[PDB]
Amino acid sequence: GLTYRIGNGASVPISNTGELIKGLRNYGPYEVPSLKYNQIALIHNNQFSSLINQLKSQISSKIDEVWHIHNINISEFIYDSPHFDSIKSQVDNAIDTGVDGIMLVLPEYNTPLYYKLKSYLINSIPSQFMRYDILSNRNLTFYVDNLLVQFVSKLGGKPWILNVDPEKGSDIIIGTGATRIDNVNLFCFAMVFKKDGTMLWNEISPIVTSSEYLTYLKSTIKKVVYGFKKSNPDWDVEKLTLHVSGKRPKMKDGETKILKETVEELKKQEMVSRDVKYAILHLNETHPFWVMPYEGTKVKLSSKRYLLTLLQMVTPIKPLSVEIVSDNWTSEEYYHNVHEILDEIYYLSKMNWRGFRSRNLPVTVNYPKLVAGIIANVNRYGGYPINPEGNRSLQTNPWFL
Amino acid sequence: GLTYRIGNGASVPISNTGELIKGLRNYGPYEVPSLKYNQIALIHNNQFSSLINQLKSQISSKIDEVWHIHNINISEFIYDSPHFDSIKSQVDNAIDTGVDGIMLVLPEYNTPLYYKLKSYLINSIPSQFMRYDILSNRNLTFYVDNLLVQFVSKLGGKPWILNVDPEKGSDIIIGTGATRIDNVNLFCFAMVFKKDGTMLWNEISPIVTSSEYLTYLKSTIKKVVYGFKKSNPDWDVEKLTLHVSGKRPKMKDGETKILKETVEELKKQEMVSRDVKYAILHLNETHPFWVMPYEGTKVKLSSKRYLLTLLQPMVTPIKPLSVEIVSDNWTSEEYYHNVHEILDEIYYLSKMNWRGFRSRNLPVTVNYPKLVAGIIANVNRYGGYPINPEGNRSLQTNPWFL
DNA sequence: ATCGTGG
DNA sequence: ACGAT
DNA sequence: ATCGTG
DNA sequence: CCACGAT
Numbered sequence: 120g121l122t123y124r125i126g127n128g129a130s131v132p133i134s135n136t137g138e139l140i141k142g143l144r145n146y147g148p149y150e151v152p153s154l155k156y157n158q159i160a161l162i163h164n165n166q167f168s169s170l171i172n173q174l175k176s177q178i179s180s181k182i183d184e185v186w187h188i189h190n191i192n193i194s195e196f197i198y199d200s201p202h203f204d205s206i207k208s209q210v211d212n213a214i215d216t217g218v219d220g221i222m223l224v225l226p227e228y229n230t231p232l233y234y235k236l237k238s239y240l241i242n243s244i245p246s247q248f249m250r251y252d253i254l255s256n257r258n259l260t261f262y263v264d265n266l267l268v269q270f271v272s273k274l275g276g277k278p279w280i281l282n283v284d285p286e287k288g289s290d291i292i293i294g295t296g297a298t299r300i301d302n303v304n305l306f307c308f309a310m311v312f313k314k315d316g317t318m319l320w321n322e323i324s325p326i327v328t329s330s331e332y333l334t335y336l337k338s339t340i341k342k343v344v345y346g347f348k349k350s351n352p353d354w355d356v357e358k359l360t361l362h363v364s365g366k367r368p369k370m371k372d373g374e375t376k377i378l379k380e381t382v383e384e385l386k387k388q389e390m391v392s393r394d395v396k397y398a399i400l401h402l403n404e405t406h407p408f409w410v411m412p413y414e415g416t417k418v419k420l421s422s423k424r425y426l427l428t429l430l431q432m433v434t435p436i437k438p439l440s441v442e443i444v445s446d447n448w449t450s451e452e453y454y455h456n457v458h459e460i461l462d463e464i465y466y467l468s469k470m471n472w473r474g475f476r477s478r479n480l481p482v483t484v485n486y487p488k489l490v491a492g493i494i495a496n497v498n499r500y501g502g503y504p505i506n507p508e509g510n511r512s513l514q515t516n517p518w519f520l
Numbered sequence: 521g522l523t524y525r526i527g528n529g530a531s532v533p534i535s536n537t538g539e540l541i542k543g544l545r546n547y548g549p550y551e552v553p554s555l556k557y558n559q560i561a562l563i564h565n566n567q568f569s570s571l572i573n574q575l576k577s578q579i580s581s582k583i584d585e586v587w588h589i590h591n592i593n594i595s596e597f598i599y600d601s602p603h604f605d606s607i608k609s610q611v612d613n614a615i616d617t618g619v620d621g622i623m624l625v626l627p628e629y630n631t632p633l634y635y636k637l638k639s640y641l642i643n644s645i646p647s648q649f650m651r652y653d654i655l656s657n658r659n660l661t662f663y664v665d666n667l668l669v670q671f672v673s674k675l676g677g678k679p680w681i682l683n684v685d686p687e688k689g690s691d692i693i694i695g696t697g698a699t700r701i702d703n704v705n706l707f708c709f710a711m712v713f714k715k716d717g718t719m720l721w722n723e724i725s726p727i728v729t730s731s732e733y734l735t736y737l738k739s740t741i742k743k744v745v746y747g748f749k750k751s752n753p754d755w756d757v758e759k760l761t762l763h764v765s766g767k768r769p770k771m772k773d774g775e776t777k778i779l780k781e782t783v784e785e786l787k788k789q790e791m792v793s794r795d796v797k798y799a800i801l802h803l804n805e806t807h808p809f810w811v812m813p814y815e816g817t818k819v820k821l822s823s824k825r826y827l828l829t830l831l832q833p834m835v836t837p838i839k840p841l842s843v844e845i846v847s848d849n850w851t852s853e854e855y856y857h858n859v860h861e862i863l864d865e866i867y868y869l870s871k872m873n874w875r876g877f878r879s880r881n882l883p884v885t886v887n888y889p890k891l892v893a894g895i896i897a898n899v900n901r902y903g904g905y906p907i908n909p910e911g912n913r914s915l916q917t918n919p920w921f922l
Numbered sequence: 923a924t925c926g927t928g929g
Numbered sequence: 930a931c932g933a934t
Numbered sequence: 935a936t937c938g939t940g
Numbered sequence: 941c942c943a944c945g946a947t
C-alpha cells in the first residue's frame with residue numbers, strides 16, 4: 120500500500136500514471152519550484168512552425184494546470200544555423216534577458232553538438248533538450264507530459280516523494296562508488312539521499328585513472344557529507360546506509376576498508392552520531408528474466424547476499440543483487456535491519472524523476488548512471504567540464520535528468 | 521489442481537499424504553502387483569524382538585489394507601551371526617522356498633555389509649532392506665507406510681501415476697547422461713518414461729573411463745529404446761524429449777552432436793517416427809535460495825534457458841532447476857508452445873517419486889538416475905556383485921534402485 | 923539402509 | 930538430530 | 935536528445 | 941539503430 124506524497128498533503132497510489140497526473144492537477148506537486156524570473160526560453164530554428172506552436176501551447180498549459188507553476192511566460196529565440204556557435208549565441212541571448220530555464224530544440228541527431236551544448240547549459244542554467252525530427256512523428260501529449268517531469272525537477276521542483284515511516288529506514292543513504300568511462304579512466308561519485316528518495320547533495324571527482332580510485336572515493340564521500348552537514352547542521356545521522364555501485368576496479372577488500380575508515384573519520388568529526396549504526400551494501404544489476412505477485416519480493420541467496428525482483432504471458436523482472444559487505448549491527452537486531460534496508464532499496468526504486476513511467480531501479484544506483492553518461496560523453500566529444508563543487512545549484516539539483 | 525490417479529478410476533490431489541493413504545485404502549493403488557508365490561520373506565536377527573513383531577504385523581496389515589495385495593503370507597528366517605555368509609545363507613534359504621520378495625533387517629549402518637548384500641539381492645529378487653537399530657514405536661507407522669511404497673514398486677506394482685492431458689507433452693521422455701563414480705570412471709544410463717511418470721525401461725552401461733563416455737552414451741540409449749520398442753511395438757513416438765543430467769565429462773558440443781546422431785539412427789531403424797519432433801534438454805540442480813505462489817513458476821532467462829522454481833517440501837526454500845534447450849527440430853511457429861509443454865512436463869515429473877509418500881520435488885528423470893548412481897558407485901567401492909540390467913527383464917522393467 | 927531436512 | 934499422515 | 939522495452 | 945507504446 121505504498122503511495123507518493125504530492126502537494127497539499129495529498130497522497131496517491133504508486134504504479135498508476137493516470138491517477139498521478141490527476142492527483143497533480145488537483146493538488147499540485149510535492150514542491151512547486153520558486154522561480155526568479157517566471158520566464159522560460161524556447162530556442163529553436165523553426166520559427167513559424169505550426170508544431171513548435173503546438174508544443175509551446177501544451178507546455179504552457181501543462182506547466183500551469185498540472186505543475187501549478189502560474190504566470191509563466193515563454194520567450195522564443197531563433198538560431199539561423201544548427202552549429203554550436205550559432206546556437207550558443209541564442210543561449211547567451213536568452214540568459215542575459217533573465218530566464219529560469221532553457222528548452223532547446225535540436226534539428227537532428229548530432230552527438231558532439233549535443234554534448235557540447237548540454238555541458239555548456241549544465242554549467243549555466245537548468246535545461247531540457249528536444250529533437251524536432253523525433254517530435255514530428257510522436258504523440259505530443261505523452262511527449263510533453265513526461266518531458267515536464269524532469270524539466271520541473273531540474274528547475275528545483277519536487278514532483279512527488281515517497282510516503283515512508285520516519286521510524287524506519289536510514290536517516291540518510293549515500294549512493295557512492297565509481298564508474299568507468301573507458302578501459303582505464305573513471306570518476307567517483309557520492310550522493311546523499313533522504314529515505315523518501317529526495318537527493319540532498321551530490322559530488323563527483325575529476326576523471327582519474329583506476330589507480331587513483333580509492334583515494335578519490337574517500338575524498339568524494341567526505342566532500343558530500345561535509346556539504347550536506349553544512350546545509351543541514353541539525354540533521355541527526357544515527358542510522359546510515361551506503362549503496363555502493365558502478366563498474367569500477369575490483370578491489371573489494373581494499374574498498375570496504377576505506378569505506379569503513381571514512382565512516383569512523385566522519386564519526387570522529389561528529390558529522391554523524393556518536394554511535395551511528397551503519398551498513399555498507401553493494402548493489403548490482405543482474406541478468407534480467409521473465410516470469411512465464413512479485414512486487415516487493417525479497418530473495419535470500421546467503422547470509423549476506425540478497426536479491427530484489429524489481430518489476431518493470433510474461434512478467435519482465437530486473438533483479439537487483441544486494442550484498443551486505445560490512446555493518447556494526449548487533450546480532451539481535453540484524454535480521455530486522457536486513458528487512459529495513461531491503462525495503463528501503465525497494466522504495467527507492469520507485470523514486471526516479473525522469474518521467475511518469477521511469478525504470479524501477481534504486482535512485483541511489485540510477486542517478487549515478489545518468490551522471491556517468493554525461494561525464495563519459497563530454498570527455499569523449501570534448502564539452503565543458505562539469506564541476507559541482509562550489510556550485511550550489513549543481514550540488515543540490517538533479518541536473519543529470 | 522494436479523492429481524494422482526490411483527485404483528478404480530479414483531484420483532487424489534498432490535501434496536497431501538493423508539488423503540493419498542486414505543485414497544489407497546478406499547480404492548487401491550493404480551496397479552496391484554501380480555505375484556507368483558503370494559509369499560514374502562522377512563529375514564532378521566532378533567527372534568524375540570517386540571519391535572520386529574510389531575514390524576511384521578504392521579507390514580501384514582498394510583500390504584492387505586493399503587495396497588490391496590490380499591492373502592500374502594510372510595515367512596520368517598533367522599540368521600545367527602550378523603555377518604555376510606550367515607545372512608546370505610538365510611537369503612538363499614528364502615529364495616529356495618519360493619518367494620516374491622525379501623525384506624531384510626540388518627543390525628545397524630554397516631556400509632560394506634549393506635552394499636555387498638544389496639548387490640546380491642538386486643541380482644536375485646525384489647528386496648527391501650531395514651535397520652534393526654532404527655525401528656521405534658514412535659516412528660513405526662511412518663516407517664512401514666513409506667517402506668511399502670517402494671517395496672510394492674519393486675514388486676512391480678504402480679502406487680500412483682500422474683493425471684496428465686494425453687494430448688500434451690512427450691510420447692516418451694528419455695532420462696540419460698552419465699555419473700562419475702570417481703575422477704576417472706563413470707557409467708552411462710538411459711531410462712524411458714511415460715509422460716505420466718511411469719518408468720518403462722532402463723539400461724546402464726558398464727563402468728568405463730571418461731574417455732569412453734560418448735561411445736557408451738550412444739550405445740546405452742539405443743539399448744533402452746530397442747528394449748522399450750520390443751516390448752511396446754505399437755507405441756507411436758511422434759514427440760520425444762531427452763532429459764540429460766549427471767556429473768559427467770565437459771563435452772557439451774560433442775555430446776549434443778552424438779545425441780542428435782543417436783536420435784537420427786533410431787529414426788532410421790523405425791524405433792521412433794521418421795518425423796519425430798524432439799528436443800534435447802540439460803537439467804541441472806542449482807543453488808537453493810529462500811524467498812523472504814512459487815509452486816510451478818517458470819522463469820525464462822533467454823530463448824534457450826529456463827528455470828523451474830521447485831519448492832522444497834518468514835523463509836520458504838526453493839530448489840531451482842535449470843533447463844537448457846541445447847537442440848530441437850521445432851518450427852519457429854510452435855517453439856514457445858512447445859517450451860511451455862516441456863517445462864510443465866518437467867514440473868509434473870517432479871511430483872513422481874515412488875520412494876515414499878512425500879514428493880522429492882525433483883524430476884524422476886534426474887532423481888532415479890541419482891539413485892542408480894548411488895548403488896553403482898558404492899557397489900564398486902565396496903566390492904559387491906556387479907549390476908547390469910541387460911538380459912534381465914526384471915531389472916530392465918522394475919525400479920530396483922528405490 | 924522408511925524417507926527427507928538441517929546442521 | 931528430527932519430523933512426517 | 936520525453937523515456938522506456940525488445 | 942530502429943519499431944512501438946505510454947495517461
Ligand SMILES: C[As](C)(=O)[O-]
Nearest residue numbers: 235501502503504
Ligand atoms: C570547453 As570546450 C567546448 O572548448 O571543450
Ligand SMILES: C[As](C)(=O)[O-]
Nearest residue numbers: 636903904905906
Ligand atoms: C562380492 As564377490 C568377490 O563374491 O563378487
Ligand SMILES: [Cl-]
Nearest residue numbers: 655656657658
Ligand atoms: Cl521403541
Ligand SMILES: [K+]
Nearest residue numbers: 565625626627
Ligand atoms: K538384524
Ligand SMILES: [Mg+2]
Nearest residue numbers: 248269519520
Ligand atoms: Mg533528460
Ligand SMILES: [Mg+2]
Nearest residue numbers: 643906907908
Ligand atoms: Mg547384473
Ligand SMILES: [Mg+2]
Nearest residue numbers: 649670921922
Ligand atoms: Mg530404498
